[PDB]
């Protein structure tokens with residue numbers, strides 16, 4: 001559905017497998033990059049951001065090489081900026097990316113790092129960073145916690161890394177596990193509930209432009 005999109009599985013080359021989700025004008029993908037993969041640099045008109053979830057990655061961008069750490073660093077490739085990658089480990093890299101034709105002014109950094117903060121709506125501790133066209137928030141949803149009803153001005157895409165989370169968007173409800181996402185367009189009512197006995201790690205991306 002629009003709010004709980006079904007991914008399309010793609011194999012991009014012998015090294016890269018993707019689960020591709022459409023979120024109106026944003027594409028969200030979960031990636032699996034093979035052990036020791038070299039990914040040739042490419043460019044495209046879509047701006048791109050992403051993070052490693054498991055493993056490690058090296059970003060090749062603007063004639064420098066930047067390491068990317070799991071659940072910490074976000075790579076940022078503005079429109080038509082040439083970017084490539086190496087997986088420096090003999091383990092697969094599991095990650096995600098978002099791609100979107102952006103209107104915003106250029107990003108000042110090719111790598112951003114999450115830092116400790118507080119989630120506005122819930123007042124729960126989180127780690128976050130804000131970029132030129134996006135904000136990424138990672139946070140633990142405690143066992144039993146109810147994410148209160150909220151209508152955001154900004155589009156939001158989210159997913160979890162472990163456990164099972166109940167998510168309601170506008171007029172539709174699903175239990176989410178890792179491998180699925182939710183998409184909440186601007187102004188839709190969203191709420192959620194961790195009915196499991198474990199703390200759930202949630203990542204959300206707010207799209208700052210329309």
Ligand SMILES: O=C(O)C(=O)Cc1ccc(O)cc1
Nearest residue numbers: 016039040041042083084085
């Ligand atoms: O999917 C994208 O746009 C990426 O940026 C990941 C990527 C980069 C370079 C390649 O040669 C293949 C895949």
Ligand SMILES: [Fe+2]
Nearest residue numbers: 042044048083
């Ligand atoms: Fe790319």
